[PDB]
Amino acid sequence: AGGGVALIRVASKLADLRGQNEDQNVGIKVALRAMEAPLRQIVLNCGEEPSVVANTVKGGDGNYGYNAATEEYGNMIDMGILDPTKVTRSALQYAASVAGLMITTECMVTDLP
Amino acid sequence: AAKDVKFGNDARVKMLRGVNVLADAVKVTLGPKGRNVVLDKSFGAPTITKDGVSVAREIELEDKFENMGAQMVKEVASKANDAAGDGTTTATVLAQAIITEGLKAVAAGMNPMDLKRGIDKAVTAAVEELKALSVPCSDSKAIAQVGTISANSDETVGKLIAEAMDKVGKEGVITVEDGTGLQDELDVVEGMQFDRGYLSPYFINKPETGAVELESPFILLADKKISNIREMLPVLEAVAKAGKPLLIIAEDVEGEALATLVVNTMRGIVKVAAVKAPGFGDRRKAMLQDIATLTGGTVISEEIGMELEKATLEDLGQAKRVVINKDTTTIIDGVGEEAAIQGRVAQIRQQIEEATSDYDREKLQERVAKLAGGVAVIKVGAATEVEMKEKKARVEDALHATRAAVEEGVVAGGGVALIRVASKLADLRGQNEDQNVGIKVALRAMEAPLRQIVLNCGEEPSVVANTVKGGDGNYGYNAATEEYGNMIDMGILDPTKVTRSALQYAASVAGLMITTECMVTDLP
Amino acid sequence: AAKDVKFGNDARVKMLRGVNVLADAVKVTLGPKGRNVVLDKSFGAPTITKDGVSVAREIELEDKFENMGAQMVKEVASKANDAAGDGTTTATVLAQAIITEGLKAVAAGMNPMDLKRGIDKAVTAAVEELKALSVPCSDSKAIAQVGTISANSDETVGKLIAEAMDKVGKEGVITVEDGTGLQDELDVVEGMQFDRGYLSPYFINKPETGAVELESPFILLADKKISNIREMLPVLEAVAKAGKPLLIIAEDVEGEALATLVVNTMRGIVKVAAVKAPGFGDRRKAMLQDIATLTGGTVISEEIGMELEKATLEDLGQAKRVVINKDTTTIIDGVGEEAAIQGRVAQIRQQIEEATSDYDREKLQERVAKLAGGVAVIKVGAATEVEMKEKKARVEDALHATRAAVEEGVVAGGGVALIRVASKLADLRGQNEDQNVGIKVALRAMEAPLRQIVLNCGEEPSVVANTVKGGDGNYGYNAATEEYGNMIDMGILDPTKVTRSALQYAASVAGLMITTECMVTDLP
Amino acid sequence: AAKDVKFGNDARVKMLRGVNVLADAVKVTLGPKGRNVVLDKSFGAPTITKDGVSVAREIELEDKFENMGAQMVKEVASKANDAAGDGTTTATVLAQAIITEGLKAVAAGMNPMDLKRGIDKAVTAAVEELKALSVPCSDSKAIAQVGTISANSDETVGKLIAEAMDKVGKEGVITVEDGTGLQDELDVVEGMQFDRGYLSPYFINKPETGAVELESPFILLADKKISNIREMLPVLEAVAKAGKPLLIIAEDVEGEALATLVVNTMRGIVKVAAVKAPGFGDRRKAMLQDIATLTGGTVISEEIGMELEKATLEDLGQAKRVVINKDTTTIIDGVGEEAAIQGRVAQIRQQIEEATSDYDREKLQERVAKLAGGVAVIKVGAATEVEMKEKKARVEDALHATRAAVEEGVVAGGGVALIRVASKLADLRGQNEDQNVGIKVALRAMEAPLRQIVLNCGEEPSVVANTVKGGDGNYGYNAATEEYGNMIDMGILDPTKVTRSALQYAASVAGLMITTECMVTDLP
């Protein structure tokens, strides 16, 4: 289900995930909120309320989501808002990789201005 | 002196900056989960309070234009608080929301006068909707419930308020006093209360409550306007050598008389409070005569023959305790003959019997009610002096809230009445598009306070607001328990008068600010 | 006046800076190996002290907001010191740790209200754990041991306090006076103590202890709120010509009377201390009558008829010595006929035996206990005057420490009680993640004081902290000997009251500062 | 390299400043009473112009953001000019009005997407209203009228264009070039015009007129694409030894052949052009065969087995005069036997009456009409060169305006059509309120050009605009004569195409700029 609702559905499913350490739990919550973010950005571009739409989509299940183009909810597959699973998976994995590399960054070397 | 003048957009921008500063200072203390503001004191120990009234009182900005905007918002909030007993923070945040949206519209090119018309129409419709949504508080059960709610769910204050309003009536005068013993005491004593207050604010005996209180004071009654002090210099000297304070009420006190009264008050040698006589003309003279009988004194009338130099300590009226406030003055348990009061009530009621005009009948009925009903005194008793003072303050707050409730009922508190009303007024339209924009501005502004409360609670404002708007009636969001349902059952009650006054005063100040085009103020 | 307003992050950072400055100033004086702080003086000779109370007393910063935060921490630390007698530095460092960690968590994006909830829950659990860990100090041997420990391992002071308490009772009143001979002297004299303090600090005769002492003073007994000076002017003149000190106890002292009393104290012509009457109402009248009988004087009452003008020296109350502090006032050896004392105590006992209600019975029982117990005066003696002053200071410090011990027991001192309680509470949980993080913050803050002490000792903080954590019971690290063991047996004791009060006040101030969102202060 | 970014409001205000500078520079020349704009050239003599095209070309801002906003409005205005033939100033002022009002609305808080939707809806309705209001231009008298007023009220051009349209229909091909004598003569020659121009702007012989003009060209007709020079250099050497210009007609010219032909053109050894073959597939080959028959030459096609190497002068196409523009070219007097044209039109004719698919049916109609219609050339003569060149410019502008009027019609000029359409579209509404705001913005923006014209005329524009709105039909205000009436009767008129294109492109650029949130540009 495209339009950034696959990530919010996955985050809703994974809201019960846990880690070995409290910092791992904080990281999991960070990842879930980040997964929430793209749909919020889309509906902010649409001019609607981000949090209300995000919570409404979270309440639903399956491929039910908010259609940005028509500003009306329902099954995202039927209206034709399809994003390939590979696209979303690769985007999420690469964003996670770059963010993990950047969070652990401690030092830099650059040419002086 | 030289003045700095701003025109058009710049003045409104400065005004918006000032209002935003004041509203952000006072708005974090809204709701049960409201934050606290730390106020600096010259002594050294800062004061940390969750009361928005003190935060608004302490706010004053360096920039003149922003300072004046903040002062106007402060003045309207204080007027709302005095009229209703609460809602300073609610009035300020409502005003800020209306102001921001209206100034945005004005910058868009909207007509300020049409915007003000739309705001006024929407607020009038909101007042009508609030009156429709209110529930009566006539039965003693609801009175006790409201009194309990006001003082942090304490049943004791509720039953004391309920029994006081049963003994004296919903329209009677109820005053609190320190309890000698542990058990709370309620007694009814003769007395009256009028709407006239002190001439200048400095006569306040206790700055914490902003009111004037006297123990066993003398009562002075003059039928002429007091301007000269030499006339009653012997009277004040006799009062000072007697020891007991003196309360003077006449047509007016001003000039050198008021100046020397302030001098005596600030020096502390003589503590005397001045309050204008109630009413005007024949009604004023009749009320003065009634007060003379109540306190056992004599009215100093120039035309009759008595004069201030001729007044002696015997002529002065006497009471055991009086309370003076800028909005009203209370006389409690004045030493006077009960037979004299019986004669006065008999002559007033026969005057009513022979009266013809409706206005005179109503005024005489008000006089006889305020003369014969008396004052119901609540003696708040506890086990410790500090907890006695705390309980007295809580009882006074509960009494004010219950008075507002019995005057106008109670709506669902916690800022959900405003959002319910704004949801009910979705179809309101004006005669102009600018009026419709103003109406939408007013609706969003009424939405705002609940959003601010739930933002202080840390939850999402928009989701909670939409969930509350989805419901109907008194259904809303509870801030303390973070769970929805009926607000009346959970005890989150705000008097309809408080919300109505806050909304109306916020609308008035917002309209005055939107229709503002220029200033005059002193240079830095 | 114009005000400078800070919102959210900036205000919290300013408070963090101020608290950090004050805490770094005061924390270097923690522990036996604590450093010392140099304090400037206008005279020229700097004051070098290892006492954190003074270091806090002369902290005040140039930045208004940092000064506000530092003054909040100073006020709560002073409240802890007054309530307990010690723990100013511990409370300050605990507050700094909680504030720093809580501000970090708030900047992380979490709800401050849930953080404060978690802090309060963890601190309540810590108080319960401290109550569980405390050992009784009721018998004479533990009392003497605690007194010895408090007075720098001096057995004479501890044992003297031991028999003083055994003679007067653990709840009895004990005062310290200068002795004449070398040998210490203990005696019991008739007297009583009440918690009514002085009106203003301007009456403090000796600033080093912050108390008021009068040798052979005259006690005024008035049943009315002192407001006018002309009433007791003849009494003041008679006392001045007598030359003995004067003391007033009444319902309240305010206005020109208080102003002229302060003026006279500054001039020194007449030494007068202003103290309110104990209790309120009929109970206050009863306590005033008890004091009158104790001093042999007569109560000047409005209902009797005689006034302050008609008062005479022989009707005026007299005592050998009185001590006045902001928290309490003590009457020592009031000159009164013993027959009247036994008559009054007998009539109090028959009132008790005829009393019915539990509250009145308890009030009369405490009244008779304080009336009949008397005052056990301690006359500390030494060969040299300066060493006798030092011994008196040690005796009074040991007296406060032993009072705290007998009130709430003793725990393993040196900051290891907090780390043991944190080890016990490491399994605590809250209703939300923010509450859990707040509990962790509170536990780490409780860890902090031992780390600071061992850092002052120069050893490794974390290693010693974890080594003490691995232990159980009162096992802990000794700062002086740099080797572990049972803290109780090694002579390092802190009263449970001191630690509990320090932790509670640090938690309260930290929650108030974490929930702070806005400020109002005067511009530079 | 490194780039500076602006977001949200700052980007919009920068773009607004740039568009404001552009519009204030270009709109002062709007209307018959337009002001003068002086422009520098590095040569030494400033130029003074009253046309908006030159000012728009010469204008740009030093700051990158304002600059790029100016160039985007400039490029949409240039697109409007290229499509319609005029209207750069009207399109630019319309764009400025929409942009200003829409950015004000966006700053007010309305959603930019809904604003763009409303603007687009209003503009589509305006296009429909303009189509309804358009007066058809098909009569020869209407052709004379549009040619006259379009050429500064010069009627001779009106009649000349009239018999041009009479000879070669309304949709035929009409051209004007330099001529001899005093009289103006018209002749029709066998020719056509397809929509292919030069592949590179460096092939141009007459940069002043922007046309690759060749006198007696000798064209090449190669069906295959030309990349290198080996197979096509025999043609170059043949035309070099024959001394005739070469033109190139091919499916697509690429490789270094284009570069070397441009180089040889620069050196002046031989003039060589390059024009694409219109269409693609087999239709392009068929119409290339048609061109070969028209010019009497042979097509070089790889499908028929022959190649470009053996292309010689005797078996290749030739023409008398060809004008190559950027988008289309005109072949004039294709030399060749008329029997070839007769055979070709016959073959195309049976292609019509045995055509199966409709689309191909209309395609064959246009092909046969284009081939058999011919090209009409008009010859302009006068006394000296300067006035006949001025007449050349006037005739070219009149011909373009006549073509536009024939294509879409004639509406009232001077912005009367826009104000009339805006008045007629007063009740348009959208789905959302922001859409209605955008519709009102578009209506006021299309009101604006007439107001600007009146302001240039010296009169205040509000009264004139309301007076013209009060009227109906083509009634409007004549700026030149300072009076009202039927705008067509006074003759001041413009083609419907110009107004429609100006409105469309102004709306497009305004929506694009309204929806802009981020701007990326190089650092200063």
From Swiss-Prot, chains B, C, D:
Origin species: Escherichia coli (strain K12)
List, alphabetically, the InterPro entries matched: Chaperonin_Cpn60_CS, Cpn60/GroEL, Cpn60/GroEL/TCP-1, GroEL-like_apical_dom_sf, GROEL-like_equatorial_sf, TCP-1-like_intermed_sf
Note one Pfam family from the annotation.
Answer: Cpn60_TCP1
The reaction(s) catalysed by this protein are: ATP + H2O + a folded polypeptide = ADP + phosphate + an unfolded polypeptide
Residue positions of the PTM N6-succinyllysine?
33, 50, 116, 276, 320, 389
HAMAP family per record: CH60
Q: Tell me how this protein assembles.
A: Forms a cylinder of 14 subunits composed of two heptameric rings stacked back-to-back. Interacts with the co-chaperonin GroES. Can form asymmetrical complexes, composed of one GroEL and one GroES, and symmetrical complexes, formed between one GroEL and two GroES oligomers. The asymmetrical complex is the functional unit. It was suggested that the symmetric heterooligomer may represent a transient intermediate in the chaperonin protein folding cycle.
The protein's name in its UniProt record: Chaperonin GroEL
